[PDB]
Design a protein around this ligand. Structure first.
Ligand SMILES: [Mg+2]
Ligand SMILES: [Mg+2]
Lengths: 266, 1085
DNA sequence: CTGGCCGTCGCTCTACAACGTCGTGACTG
DNA sequence: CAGTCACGACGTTGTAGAGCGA
């Protein structure tokens, strides 16, 4: 048996695929990092940070012996370790495995694939098997602590927030919450509001109680959150820090998320 | 009184253009120390030496430089009663000049000679030494050039009744001529006679009557051949008088010992009176060719002098860092180093330094010279450029070195001098060679001339050998700067003064000028050493002797004229005449087969069979010639197919060549006689003295070079005597032989039993595993045979036996297949590209990047390390053998074998070193040759042309055509991206190319992405063959060895840190990275 | 009573640069 | 939900360098 083992099969592989289907080849270039807690995918889109965590709970079987490991998704700058989950590229899947080998400073991941064969006998797609070495000296910065305020939007609501921001640095936008739960965003033009709770314009969340204002010259939101194809999703503010930032998450275990750096207006 | 013919060199001078740096005026205020004085001055030119002073042009009891001259202007300076007897003399050079009886009125020539130049005539001057060291000129009278025209054709065209009619027609045609140059030419300037000859082309060509027409002058002959009757074919009109002299007299040579002797009616060579001398000789004679004989048995070179010289220049314009231009009056020659050697002993005799301004050589340099037993440098000082150049040209005239060498003298040192002497000053050069006037003294650069192979210099009696030309033809170097060549060939590291250092050293007083002096002398001594290592004069004279052309033409005039002249000698004694082509597309015919290689790394023994002198042997074996070919089948109907002629299809046409017993091929006769001669010479090299052995070695090499050229001669479209039927037949037969060898080997020794049936000695060569013997490669005349199941140890001999067996099986007796070598390992990469190790142990590298001049030292060293691993490490050798067990695509999906870890280690180390900020930029210098003039390029966007125009913009030294231009590829900074659009994203290599001197000086960074990509490229190209010959798979697998690193841009990292993001990876203990993930996943949620 | 040029062959790989096309990719009514 | 303007990468040709073999 391999020293480290990961398996997706059946509904679990049906799950991960169900999770990945909306990603739309955005994440395929990425850092992939691995531990006992699961798999984490990381990439920058238009400069802003993007992540997809996958907890060990989503895997049919798992292991993790050795330090954290880190890979780049792109294999030989052409194929990728995530290509498997671009669901229309392989409608035929039945199992996928990851295994790791080599000692802790210089490991290698191997990825293996099996498919339907007019029957469930799971023939191996041997030619498609992938190998990728560990990054020797990677450094990646990741979220920490807890969001200070959370707000929960449906697909209509979140898209209308994207409508409510201006499109570029020539059209800066301010996100706000006013006292007694008046969430808002505006861009001189394109002013909108949602009524917070701890029907169309109501928003649910946590720590909704605190009033604040943050402004954004960054163009990114109109592009990033569209091309991760967000459905329903949460705003998760990190408002407290000298520079605040906003994690906008999706919904379901496809919790693909992007963190937007804001103006440090005191 | 006065010389019969006027001397045109300066024997006296009292007004000249004085040009001199103002910085030499030590008492002048600095307001007045810039630039040059330039004005005419009414003094005789002076030279200063050791506190003494002399007129440059006075010949007398003193003298600051040696002389080997008798006359000066009209004065005879030989001691009274000087009248040496000449019996034997060595000839090194031959001139041909036209004399006129009327001009020779008052020279007291005997009637024999006057007759020969009566209207006018061509005189062959043999230039030479006596064994006592006197300079000799022997003027030979009575050699006429001639050409032929078919009698029937010219009788039809001109209605000639007689040979005298033809002469009348020819004189008339020259009289009514543009330019009116043939004034008073007469029918009696011509003789015509009727002879029977055959045109050399085709076996069917019947003998016919021709008028042979004698002409007294080359000018006449060349005009008649261009203009007389263009419709009527001419034969041998291109042959010069020297050639006629050499061929019309049996055994005569263009380089070698002669004797004077009684001629036809006991006639004797007449000594010329000194006033009738044509040249700066000590003694001169008039004679006819029957007064001459080869002095056989006399061997050794006489005491000829070699001058090795080097000029240095200084710019004078406002920009003193601009490279000097020659045509600019103020860009002066400031020093001329001049070393005089005796060729017979190799001894340095004189060291002469010419300097504009005072010049005190450093004592350290004088002591080094004194230690080495070298003559103390005489330093000659001049107040102006003119006086220095005049003095140098005077030394050249008065000392008259028969040989002149230097380094890049043809491209730089000579042109710069001649430009000054002819453009700035108006000195006629035509008296400054051996003749006293009217001689050639000329440089030809390549220029726009599409044809011209090299730059040339002709000085009428002075053999110029440029060591830059010699070295680039005998050593393969990325750079041919003198100090690189010194390091490579002589094994001396030597400092080399930059042109940009010269101005400061010049203006820093006499001692600093002395330092420039030291450098100039050291340069010239290196060049001396190179010359005496390679002994280029011995090679060249050997070829000159063999080919029957003069030494000068041997050096500058190509390969064709060598075969042409030998073929002419043989055609003559057979009754053939050679026709001249009138006037002045990729390939003319199909060449050699190269088999498709079984590409891979072969660890079983590989034997190489190769045909010795394939194309020469084919020409002999199949009796191939102009004169043996027929296109018409009609031409051979009286002969029997098979036994009288070869019928062969060539270029999609049926050719016939008759066999040797019908008619023997002229080309075959040449090659047979030469190869006999070569075998004879090599049979004596063992039982010879070390001094004699050097000469014999030079002789046999000359023969090899000339034999090898015969095939090419036939293949030249628009050459002297082309025949593309012969050239194409040679390669056709060669193609058939290579395939025949393959078919035979495959059939005959498919099974080990069959090999043992031929070679009992194979019985104890059998190695473990299955026997097979298959041809894996072959190119032109070599074939490579992979011999599974046999041991390398015995293979050499058994293969020599097999080669000899295949020979007598398949091929006619001059043809000989030989077993050259066995490889124990062979990386057969591609056609014309392989790396392997010979059974003795030696690595042979062919075709690949490691042995190409263009690529930089860094990439080459790394490549050589990877190759030395694959071949000379056991572990890696086995791993590379083990890759071959599987299809190449599978290696993308399995761990690469354990042994190839070391090969990985080398790439990792190279990656690490390439990005070292304390790298030496010389390791990154790429180079390419200017093949042609920059405006003869179609694709203008090339790295070396980019650097070429940058150098010219910067007024740096512009490279000559055929020079290798060094460059580095610089980092694409925004400043660079500017300069480019400032010449009207990712930029091409060409745009990021730069002169390495500039790159050093301005601290320009190298393009590491380029150089590392190019390393991985060189690796990938070479080791494709380990991985199914697939470049994409190999690039992938090699790239997997490098330690990849990912971290965000520093600005982003900083900003994220200010927003409370935690770290994973480096910069933290592993447990902190674990901790941080457990926060991350739950905050991403 | 003044003028001339020049003058081995073909095969082959590889890099480089220019040219055209291809699959992707967010997109609007 | 599909006709669509646009973009980075790929394959292909020609040139050029430079060697291979006579
Ligand atoms: Mg020099
Ligand atoms: Mg050979």
């Amino acid at each position: 048996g391999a020293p480290c083992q990961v398996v997706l099969q059946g509904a679990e592989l049906n799950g991960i695929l169900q999770a990945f289907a909306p990603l739309r080849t955005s994440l395929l270039d990425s850092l992939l990092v691995m531990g006992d807690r699961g798999i984490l995918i990381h990439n920058t889109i238009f400069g802003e940070q993007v992540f997809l965590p996958l907890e060990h709970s989503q895997f049919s079987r798992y292991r993790w012996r050795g330090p954290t490991a880190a890979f780049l998704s792109l294999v030989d700058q052409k194929r990728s370790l995530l290509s498997v989950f671009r669901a229309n590229q392989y409608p035929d899947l039945r199992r996928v495995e990851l295994a790791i080998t080599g000692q802790a400073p210089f490991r290698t991941l191997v990825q293996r694939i099996w498919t339907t064969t007019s029957d469930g006998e799971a023939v191996e797609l041997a030619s498609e098997t992938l190998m990728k070495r560990e990054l020797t000296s990677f450094v990646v910065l990741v979220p920490q602590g807890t969001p200070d305020v959370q707000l929960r939007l449906t697909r209509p609501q979140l898209t209308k927030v994207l409508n409510a921001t201006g499109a570029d640095s020539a059209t800066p936008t301010t996100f706000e919450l006013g006292v007694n739960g008046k969430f808002s965003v505006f861009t001189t033009s394109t002013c909108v509001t949602f009524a917070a709770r701890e029907n169309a314009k109501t928003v649910y969340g946590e720590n909704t109680h605190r009033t604040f204002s943050v402004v954004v010259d960054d163009c990114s939101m109109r592009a990033v959150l569209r091309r991760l194809q967000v459905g329903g999703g949460t705003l998760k503010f990190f408002l407290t820090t000298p520079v605040p930032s906003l994690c906008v998450t999706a919904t379901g275990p496809n919790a693909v998320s992007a963190v937007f750096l804001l103006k440090p207006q005191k | 009184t006065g010389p019969t013919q006027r001397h045109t060199y300066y024997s006296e001078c009292d007004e000249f253009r004085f040009i001199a740096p103002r910085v030499l005026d030590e008492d002048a205020p600095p307001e007045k120390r810039a630039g040059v004085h330039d004005g005419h001055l009414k003094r005789a030119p002076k030279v200063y030496c050791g506190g003494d002073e002399r007129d440059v042009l006075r010949v007398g009891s003193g003298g600051f430089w040696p002389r080997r001259s008798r006359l000066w202007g009209g004065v005879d300076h030989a001691p009274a009663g000087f009248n040496p007897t000449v019996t034997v003399f060595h000839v090194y050079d031959i001139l041909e000049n036209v004399e006129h009886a009327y001009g020779m009125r008052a020279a007291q020539f005997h009637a024999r000679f006057m007759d020969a130049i009566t209207p006018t005539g061509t005189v062959i001057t043999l230039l030479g030494l006596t064994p006592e060291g006197h300079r000799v000129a022997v003027h030979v009278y009575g050699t006429r050039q001639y050409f032929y025209m078919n009698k029937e054709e010219v009788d039809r065209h001109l209605q000639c009744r007689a040979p005298r009619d033809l002469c009348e027609r020819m004189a008339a045609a020259l009289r009514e001529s543009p330019g009116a140059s043939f004034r008073g030419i007469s029918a009696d300037h011509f003789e015509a006679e009727v002879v029977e000859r055959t045109d050399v082309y085709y076996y069917e060509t019947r003998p016919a009557l021709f008028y042979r027409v004698y002409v007294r002058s080359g000018r006449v002959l060349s005009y008649l051949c261009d203009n007389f009757c263009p419709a009527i074919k001419k034969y041998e009109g291109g042959v010069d008088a020297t050639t006629r002299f050499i061929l019309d007299n049996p055994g005569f040579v263009t380089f070698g010992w002669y004797r004077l002797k009684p001629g036809r009616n006991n006639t004797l060579a007449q000594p010329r009176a000194p006033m009738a001398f044509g040249t700066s000789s000590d003694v001169e004679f008039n004679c006819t060719a029957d007064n001459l004989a080869i002095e056989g048995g006399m061997s050794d070179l006489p005491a000829y002098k070699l001058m090795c010289f080097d000029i240095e220049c200084k710019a004078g314009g406002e920009d003193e860092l601009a490279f000097p231009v020659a045509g600019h009056p103020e860009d002066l020659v400031i020093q001329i180093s001049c070393l005089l050697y005796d060729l017979s002993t190799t001894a340095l005799e004189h060291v002469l330094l010419f300097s504009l301004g005072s010049c005190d050589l450093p004592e350290s340099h004088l002591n080094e010279l004194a230690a080495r037993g070298l003559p103390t440098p005489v330093v000659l000082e001049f107040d102006s450029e003119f006086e220095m150049l005049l003095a140098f040209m005077t030394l050249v005239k008065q000392y008259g070195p028969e040989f002149v060498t230097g380094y890049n003298i043809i491209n730089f040192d000579w042109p710069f001098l001649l430009a000054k002497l002819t453009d700035i000053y108006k000195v006629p050069l035509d008296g400054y060679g051996r003749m006293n006037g009217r001689g050639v003294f000329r440089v030809w650069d390549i220029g726009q001339s599409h044809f011209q192979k090299r730059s040339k210099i002709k000085v009428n009696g002075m053999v110029n050998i440029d060591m830059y030309g010699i070295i680039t033809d005998k050593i393969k170097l990325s750079s041919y700067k003198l100090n690189a060549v010194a390091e490579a060939v002589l094994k001396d590291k030597k400092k080399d003064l930059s042109y940009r250092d010269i101005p400061a050293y010049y203006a820093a007083g006499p001692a600093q000028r002395g330092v420039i002096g030291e450098y100039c002398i050291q340069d010239s001594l290196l060049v001396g050493q190179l010359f005496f290592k390679f002994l280029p004069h011995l090679e060249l004279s050997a070829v000159a002797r063999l080919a029957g052309i003069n030494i000068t033409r041997t050096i500058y005039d190509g390969q064709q004229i060598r075969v042409f002249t030998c073929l002419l000698r043989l055609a003559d004694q057979k009754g053939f005449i050679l026709p001249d082509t009138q006037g002045r597309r990729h390939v003319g015919y199909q060449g050699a087969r190269v088999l498709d290689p079984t590409s891979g790394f072969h660890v079983n023994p590989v034997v190489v069979f190769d045909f010795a002198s394939l194309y020469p042997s084919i020409i002999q074996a199949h009796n191939l010639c102009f004169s043996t070919l027929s296109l018409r089948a009609d031409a051979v109907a009286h002969l029997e197919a098979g036994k009288d002629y070869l019928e062969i299809e060539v270029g999609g046409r049926r050719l016939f060549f008759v066999k040797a017993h019908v008619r023997e091929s002229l080309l075959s006769i040449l090659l047979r006689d030469w190869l006999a001669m070569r075998k004879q010479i090599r049979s004596r090299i063992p039982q010879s003295s070390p001094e004699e052995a050097v000469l014999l070695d030079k002789q046999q090499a000359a023969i090899k070079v000339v034999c090898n050229s015969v095939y090419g001669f036939t293949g030249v479209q628009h050459g002297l005597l082309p025949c593309l039927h012969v050239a194409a037949t040679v390669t056709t037969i060669g193609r058939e032989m290579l395939l025949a060898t393959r078919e035979y080997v495959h059939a005959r020794w498919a099974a080990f039993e069959q090999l043992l049936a031929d070679f009992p000695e194979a019985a104890d060569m059998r190695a473990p595993g299955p026997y097979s013997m298959r041809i894996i490669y072959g190119d032109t005349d070599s074939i490579f045979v992979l011999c599974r199941g046999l041991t390398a140890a015995g293979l050499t001999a058994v293969g020599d036996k097999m080669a000899s067996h295949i020979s007598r099986a398949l091929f006619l007796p001059p043809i000989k297949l030989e077993c050259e070598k066995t490889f124990t390992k062979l990386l057969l990469i591609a056609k014309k590209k392989y790396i392997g190790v010979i059974y003795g142990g030696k690595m042979l590298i062919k075709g690949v990047d490691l042995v190409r001049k263009n690529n930089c030292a860094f990439i080459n060293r790394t490549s050589r390390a990877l190759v030395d691993l694959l071949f000379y490490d056991d572990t890696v050798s086995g791993a590379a053998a083990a890759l071959a067990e599987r299809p190449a695509e599978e290696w993308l999906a399995r761990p690469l074998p354990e042994g190839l870890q070391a090969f990985g280690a080398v790439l990792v180390d190279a990656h690490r070193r390439i990005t070292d900020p304390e790298r030496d930029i010389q390791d990154f210098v790429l180079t390419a040759e200017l093949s042609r003039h920059p405006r003869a390029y179609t694709n203008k966007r090339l790295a070396h042309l980019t650097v070429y125009y940058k150098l010219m913009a910067r007024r740096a030294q512009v490279p000559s055509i055929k020079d290798r231009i060094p460059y580095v590829i610089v980092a694409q900074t925004r400043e660079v991206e500017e300069t480019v659009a400032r010449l009207a994203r990712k930029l091409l290599v060409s745009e990021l190319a730069e002169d390495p001197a500039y790159a050093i000086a301005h601290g320009v960074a190298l393009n590491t992405d380029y150089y590392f990509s190019h390393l991985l490229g060189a690796a990938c190209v070479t080791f494709k063959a380990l991985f199914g010959n697939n470049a994409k798979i190999t690039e992938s697998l090699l790239k997997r060895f490098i330690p990849e690193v990912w971290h965000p841009p520093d600005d982003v990292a900083a900003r994220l840190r200010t927003a409370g993001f935690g770290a994973v990876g480096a910069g933290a203990t592993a447990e902190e990275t674990r901790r941080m993930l457990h926060r991350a996943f739950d905050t991403l949620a």
